[PDB]
């Protein structure tokens, strides 16, 4: 239909990788 | 005059091929895409109010093959609604095929396909990091200036169901009301400082309390507390941004109050990353589709 003009929750398979030490880079 | 379905068909012909097959559209077809997309961008708000269901994607950076994989997993339009967070060109080898397909889908579906402005949709940046060299080699300098005029009209932020705030970079110390974004006039360049700059450049940082100097040399960093205060002030539930490479394609921050999306796998070479796409259904129930490197 149309997209352009509730609560946000996550599915069971979604894991929280915040404190998992996942590496991230701002550039290369 | 703009044969949109033939352009899309030629762009999708290399589907099923080994990564690297080019699609050489005509200069007039690409210029037609830019002009028609530009007028559609200007007719729509600079702060998009969107509705679920839709799929949100991060940086592509000219990796056209992985953009087609992303469309295969989530469904080519109009099977699914799409929102891209910017950074479509530079670094990659096929920035032209990438941006042309996204612009064509924006023209073919102006109410179910949306593109936000990243810091690489800027002439000061993409002149250096690859897109200008790709335009000069395969076309001419004049077509690159046409892309710039189109990039200067891209929307800056999007809000999904009044609950998910979306931008390329992140928050700004000059962002107090959403009306400040809506009043930004287009076409416009990306300044070195201010609200528009921070929305395309800023980053979250765990080891920063409040606002700090960003080591990119541009904009600022913000902590988990700036996110929580920003969400509470505007009754938002989640910040959705990109702009940073992440190992799993996504990365949570501030206890799932902010997420970083990156949709270009094997981006750094010295660091192997995956690509991710965020799926949001009508009830704002979100999940992640992961694009494993090829
Ligand atoms: Mn970026
Ligand atoms: Mn980027």
Author numbering:
A (entry chain C): 27 to 31, 39 to 61
B (entry chain A): 6 to 299
From the paper:
Protein Phosphatase 1 (PP1; 37.5 kDa) is the most widely expressed and abundant serine/threonine phosphatase. All phosphoprotein phosphatases (PPPs), including PP1, require two metal ions at their active site (M1 and M2), which activate a water molecule to hydrolyze the phosphate group from substrates. Inhibitor-3 (I3) is an ancient inhibitor of PP1 with putative roles in PP1 maturation and the regulation of PP1 activity. In addition to a canonical RVxF motif, which is shared by nearly all PP1 regulators and inhibitors, and a non-canonical SILK motif, I3 also binds PP1 via multiple basic residues that bind directly in the PP1 acidic substrate binding groove, an interaction that provides a blueprint for how substrates bind this groove for dephosphorylation.
We also determined the crystal structure of the reconstituted I3:PP1 complex, where both proteins were expressed separately in E. coli and co-purified (2.5 Å resolution). The structures are identical (RMSD = 0.24 and 0.36 Å2 for PP1 and I3, respectively) and thus all further discussion is focused on the mammalian (Expi293F) produced I3:PP1 complex. In both the reconstituted and co-expressed I3:PP1 complexes, both metals are present at the catalytic site. Unlike SDS22, which selectively binds an inactive form of PP1 (only a single metal at the active site), the I3:PP1 complex contains two metals at the PP1 active site and thus should be capable of dephosphorylating substrates. Our structure shows that the I3 CCC motif binds across the active site. Taken together, the NMR, crystallography and SPR data show that the CCC motif binds in a dynamic, fuzzy manner at the PP1 active site, instead of a single conformation, which is essential for both PP1 binding and inhibition.
